[PDB]
Amino acid sequence: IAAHKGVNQAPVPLKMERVGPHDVHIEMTAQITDIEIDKGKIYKAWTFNGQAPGPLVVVNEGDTIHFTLKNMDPVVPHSMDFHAVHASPSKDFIDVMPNKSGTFTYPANKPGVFMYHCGTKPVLQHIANGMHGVIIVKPKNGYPTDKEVDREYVLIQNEWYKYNDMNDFQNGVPSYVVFSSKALKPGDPNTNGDTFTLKEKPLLAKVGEKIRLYINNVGPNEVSSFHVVGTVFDDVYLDGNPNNHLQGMQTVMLPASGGAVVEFTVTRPGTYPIVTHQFNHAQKGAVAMLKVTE
Amino acid sequence: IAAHKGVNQAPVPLKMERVGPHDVHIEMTAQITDIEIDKGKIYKAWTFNGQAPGPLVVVNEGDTIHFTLKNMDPVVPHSMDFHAVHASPSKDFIDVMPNKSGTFTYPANKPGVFMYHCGTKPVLQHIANGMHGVIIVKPKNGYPTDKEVDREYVLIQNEWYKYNDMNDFQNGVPSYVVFSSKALKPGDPNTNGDTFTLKEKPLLAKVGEKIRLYINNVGPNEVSSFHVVGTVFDDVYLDGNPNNHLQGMQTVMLPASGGAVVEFTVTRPGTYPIVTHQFNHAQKGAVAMLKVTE
Amino acid sequence: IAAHKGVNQAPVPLKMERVGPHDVHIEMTAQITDIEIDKGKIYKAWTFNGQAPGPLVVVNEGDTIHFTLKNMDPVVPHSMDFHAVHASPSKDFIDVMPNKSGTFTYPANKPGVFMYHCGTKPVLQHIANGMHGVIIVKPKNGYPTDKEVDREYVLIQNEWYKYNDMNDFQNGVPSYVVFSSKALKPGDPNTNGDTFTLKEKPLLAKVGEKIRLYINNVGPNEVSSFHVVGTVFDDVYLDGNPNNHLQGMQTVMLPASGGAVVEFTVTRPGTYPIVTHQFNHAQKGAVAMLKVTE
Ligand SMILES: [Cu+2]
Ligand SMILES: [Cu+2]
Ligand SMILES: [Cu+2]
Ligand SMILES: [Cu+2]
Ligand SMILES: [Cu+2]
Ligand SMILES: [Cu+2]
Ligand SMILES: [Cu+2]
Ligand SMILES: [Cu+2]
Ligand SMILES: [Cu+2]
Ligand SMILES: [Cu+2]
Ligand SMILES: [Cu+2]
Ligand SMILES: [Cu+2]
Ligand SMILES: [Cu+2]
Ligand SMILES: [Cu+2]
Ligand SMILES: [Cu+2]
Ligand SMILES: [Cu+2]
Ligand SMILES: [Cu+2]
Ligand SMILES: [Cu+2]
């Protein structure tokens, strides 16, 4: 795209504020940002807020979201689809033209770990070029294992293909498959989907802790066989709904767009890889590390 | 196949009749029929009854099926495998030669949404060329959410490859991935697996309704990440068994041959896409629409 | 690998012995062994004990495993990762150099049907060349359907690619996809992952029996749509955990590394194919047979 040549828009922080007991304002941008997806490889991503996956959004079950999208792309229209919400797609997930803004409103009345993404046609193009992320909706009455959890992180899986290559997006294998982590609390890491960051700067935990991961596989195209080496998931909630409650799973199957809450215990000091167990994807990037110390 | 050149056998209606409180007769054909799978693209499909996927079959839990297959193919043998039934494959799913008929009998004692398909070797060839469909077995005591449902439809996912190309069927990506809908009640649409019909003639619903979809992914080869844009599934029954009961799922993972009953609420007027969220498949056809009016 | 040319190390039996009420010794080898994976096709596999998948391991829930690996490979390091155990990967799943041994100790405190595999980098290479298998951990209080089961077998799914070809392992479709069976009791078959053995020498059962299969899909890369032709699974326990309890499933979705216990009834005499319903995989080998007699 000739209007993207040389464009590298600095990342902009997510803006969010609660405006009532059950109402929240969220304010994101669509923007064109260079991301290093593998060592030496820059992808001029289409993003929300200059991150891909986009910034983490967390709301409470029952919250109405009043969402604004500011489109900084000079030429391409963008939009937002949150999987958390009940909405009319053809009224509420519509395009925002270059250099304009749009505001849309809709309720999040289901707890869980939901994908969000651009919904502009062709959707595959928009998601593959980087316009994906996660919204977590916290359950009103929690999960039944809340009191057992010591520490929590967010992980997102995505793929990268040949740059803006529709034929590759539809017909090709991924070039890279990657994890990212998005921050829940001050001090947590906040990364982009790349092959290396969570290997070189592992997530951190303490011996004996029960870890919860909020996870989503945003695709665009692949399913994920999510596994943590050296442990067994004690509890799994499919899509993060507390009712969907599995126990003792070695590996969690995630459809494209699928989420889960998983919880496991790290019993001994050491570094614990986190993988998709489709090992062609692992090999192409999708390995994160959790370093567990005394 | 030289004996298929120029062959285009008109579709024949499914014949079905109840012959006892727990016994039903079903009568299908195997036939060679030209189907438009994408605009301008004809596939000379191998079919049941001149539809691909084949016609919908609905029986009650406990019904014995007395199934007859009339093979109208001039040269290729065909057969029937219903996933609903308990049967001896090597006695009851056997071939019916060109211009002959065979009758087989077997019980459907498990509720759910089951694939059926030809079982002639090589099975991949027979399923890929179009010999697939769905049988629904209705549970004796229903589903626990029956009283909440306003409206229901059947959707089937399948793939199409290069015409009768075994190498492509085994080694290639799909050319097209498509939905079809099969009628449950008078007036419902009844379509074939193509890229466009359920975009141009959407399924219809009313604002506020709870929708149930009977869904099956017949493959042959891919798994499906089934999602309805702008809603969350309130309830999911895996394989349509009322015991397998998930809640609040954004996306349902379907193995090849896998089914589900899913239920969701459409809260606002508009058009709601229905997709597999493996967006390379979506892009290659697998998008249906649900138009929701006042 | 020049040091593997001409190498074909005879298979060595698994050594296992109980050394306390909750402690077991296991002793395996890593070795280079020619396996016939399809008729006329030899793969010089990297294996545990000269079988691929490796030998079956069965322990009780609560057992500590004291595992020894003897590396007979003349040049490549190997390791062991059991999905059953809680362990520090970077202390307990470490490499054993050529012509050396290592002993590692760790608890299996979760019931189920777990993958094991080499964990040497690049893991994809080690798993693809044959270093995979299953450990079953038997639940302390069984499964609730134990008393209904007549007969049981173990089945494992894996893929084979172009020989030791990293590009193919990461980017290519499988050449073959295969089942194997591993013995639980004297007289049961014990086979390697190949296209033909369980077609030519089917598993055996009697009319009317309820069959349990312990199943795992070891990948490396594909997911599995597991189905038995001519029946419906009465009960399914995901990952073999008795809590994860589905009913009436036609087809069970298995992630890569994913397991299950499945149970079904064979009602009539005949031969019952067992497949992955991703029929491109079936066609490339992944069909086993169960011959059911009076
Ligand atoms: Cu309130
Ligand atoms: Cu507002
Ligand atoms: Cu966009
Ligand atoms: Cu979506
Ligand atoms: Cu792929
Ligand atoms: Cu703790
Ligand atoms: Cu009766
Ligand atoms: Cu009859
Ligand atoms: Cu046929
Ligand atoms: Cu089948
Ligand atoms: Cu494909
Ligand atoms: Cu209603
Ligand atoms: Cu004891
Ligand atoms: Cu010992
Ligand atoms: Cu190894
Ligand atoms: Cu593993
Ligand atoms: Cu493949
Ligand atoms: Cu019995």
DSSP string, C78-135: B--EETTS---HHHHS--B-TT-EEEEEEEE-S-EEEEEE--PSSHHHHHHTT-EEEE
Cα(A215)–Cα(A112) distance, integer angstroms? 10
Rounded distance, CA C244 to CA C38, Å?
Answer: 36
Name all domains of chain B by residue range, CATH numbers in brackets: 1-294 (2.60.40.420)
The rounded distance, in Å, linking the Cα atoms of A270 and B209 is 53
Q: Is C280 helix (H, G, I), strand (E, B) or coil?
A: helix
Dig out the tokens for B143 from the structure: 């589903």
- B156-B47-B1-B40 Cα dihedral, nearest 10 degrees: -60
What is the residue type of C83? H
Neighbours of ion ligand 13 (CB under 5 A): C 21
Give the separation between CA B273 and CA A120, rounded to whole angstroms: 12
Q: How was this structure determined?
A: X-ray
Spell out which residues of chain C touch residue A173, defining contact as CB-CB under 8 Å. Answer: 171
Question: Dihedrals φ, ψ of B242, to 5°?
Answer: -65, -20
Task: Provide the terminal-to-terminal Cα distance of chain C, rounded to the nearest Å.
Answer: 51
Cβ atoms within 10 Å of C1's Cβ, excluding its own: 13
Look up residue C81 and give its two tokens. Answer: 């990762």
CA atoms within 13 A on the CB side of B268: 17
Residue of C nearest to A246 (CA): C244
- Chain B: give the shortest CA distance to residue C29, in Å: 35
Beta bridge partners of residue C241, listed in sequence order: none
Write the CA distances from C213 to C140, C170, C210, C260, integer angstroms: 19, 30, 10, 8
As a whole number of angstroms, the distance between CA A140 and CA A84 comes to 15
Give contacts of B244 with chain C, Cβ < 8 Å: 246-249
The C-alpha of A43 sits at a distance from chain B's nearest C-alpha, in angstroms, of: 20
Q: How many CB atoms sit inside 10 A of residue A13's CB?
A: 11
3-class secondary structure for chain A?
CHHHCCCCCCCCCCEEEEEECCEEEEEEEEEEEEEEEECCEEEEEEEECCECCCCCEEEECCEEEEEEEEECCCCCCECCEECCCCCCHHHHCCCECCCCEEEEEEEECCCEEEEEECCCCCHHHHHHCCCEEEEEEECCCCCCCHHHCCEEEEEEEEEECCCCCHHHHHHCCCCEEEEEEECCCCCCCCCCCECCHHHHCCEEEECCCEEEEEEEECCCCCCEEEEECCCCEEEEEECCCCCCEEEEECCEEECCCCEEEEEEECCCCEEEEEEECCHHHHHCCCEEEEEEEC
Interface partners of chain B (CB pairs < 8 Å, 3 or more) are A, C
- Biggest CA-to-CA distance, chain A: 54
| Residue A277 touches partner C, C-beta closer than 8 Å | yes
Nearest to C55 by CA among C188, C191, C176, C160: C191
Best mutation target among B226, B232, B235, B281 (most A Cβ atoms within 10 Å) is B232
Both structure tokens of A80: 């937002």
The rounded Å distance from CA C15 to ligand 14 centre is 13
The pair phi, psi for residue A43, each rounded to 5°, is: -115, 125
Query: At B26, which amino acid appears?
Result: I
State the Cα–Cα distance between residues A178 and A282, nearest whole angstrom: 8
Contact C202, C229 (CB under 8 A): no
Helix (H) / strand (E) element for B20: namely: strand B15-20
Closest CA to A215 of A30, A13, A11, A53: A53
> Which residues partner with C63 through β-bridges?
C108
- C216: nearest Cα among C148, C184, C282, C262: C262
Q: What number of CA atoms fall less than 13 Å from residue C88's CA on the CB side? A: 17
Amino acid at residue number A30: A
In chain B, what is the greatest distance between 2 CA atoms, to the nearest angstrom?
54
Q: How many CB atoms lie within 10 A of CB B52?
A: 27
Q: Known binding site: residues of C?
A: 4, 22-23, 25, 36, 38, 61, 66, 78, 81, 83, 86, 117-118, 126, 131, 150, 152, 165, 209, 222, 227, 231-232, 234, 245, 253, 277, 281
Query: Cα(B23) to centroid of ligand 7, in Å?
Result: 10
Contacts of C272 in chain B (CB under 8 A): 88-90
When CB atoms are compared, the residue of C230, C250, C279 closest to B89 is: C230
C-alpha A119 chain-centroid distance: 16
Chain-chain contact of A92 with B246 (C-beta, under 8 angstroms): no
Residue with tokens 């994408």: B38
Tokens 């604002």, residue?
B207
The tokens describing C15, both together, are 């050594």
- Report resolution in angstroms: 1.3
Please report residues of A whose CB lies closer than 8 A to that of C91: 268-270
Q: Taking CB atoms and an 8 Å limit, are B280 and A124 in contact across chains?
A: yes
CA angle C12, C16, C22 (to 5 degrees): 165
Residue A235 contacts by C-beta under 8 Å, 6 or more apart in sequence? A143, A145, A245, A246, A247, A262, A263
Amino acid at A102: G
Interchain pair A250, C239: CB under 8 A: yes
Of A16, A54, A52, A47, which Cα lies nearest the Cα of A32?
Answer: A47
Cα C138–chain centre separation:
16
The token duo for B207 is 């604002």
The number of C-alpha atoms within 13 Å of B125 and in the hemisphere containing its C-beta is 11
Which region holds residue B37: left if phi is over 0, alpha if psi is between -120 and 50, else beta? alpha
Q: How far is CA A205 from the centre of its chain?
A: 21
- For residue C224, the SS3 value is strand
| Interacting residues of A263 by C-beta distance below 8 A, sequence separation 6+ | A145, A148, A149, A210, A211, A212, A213, A233, A234, A235, A236
Region label for C239, one of left (φ > 0), alpha (ψ between -120 and 50) or beta (otherwise): left
Question: What string of DSSP letters covers B238-264?
Answer: ETT-TTSEEEEES-EEE-TT-EEEEEE
Tokens of A260: 């889960």
CA distance B99 to C280: 29
Distance to chain A for B15, nearest Cα, Å = 38
Is A218:A132 a contact under the CB 8 Å cutoff? yes
Could you say which ligand is closest to the alpha carbon of residue C79? 15
Q: Evaluate whether B105 touches B206 at the Cβ level (below 8 Å).
A: no
CA angle, A65 as apex, A63 and A69 as ends, to 5°?
Answer: 160
3-state helix, strand, coil in chain B (%, to 5): 10, 45, 40
Give CA–CA dist B129/B126, Å, rounded: 5
Eight-class DSSP state of B60 = E
Picking from C90, C136, C254 by the largest number of A CB atoms within 10 A of its own CB, the best residue to mutate is C90
Q: CA A44, CA A35: separation in Å to the nearest integer? A: 6
Chain B residues lying within 8 Å of A111, measured CB to CB: 248
Tell which residues of chain B come right before a gap with C–N over 2.5 A.
none
For chain B, where are the alpha helices, taking DSSP H only? 89-92, 123-128, 166-171, 197-200, 279-283
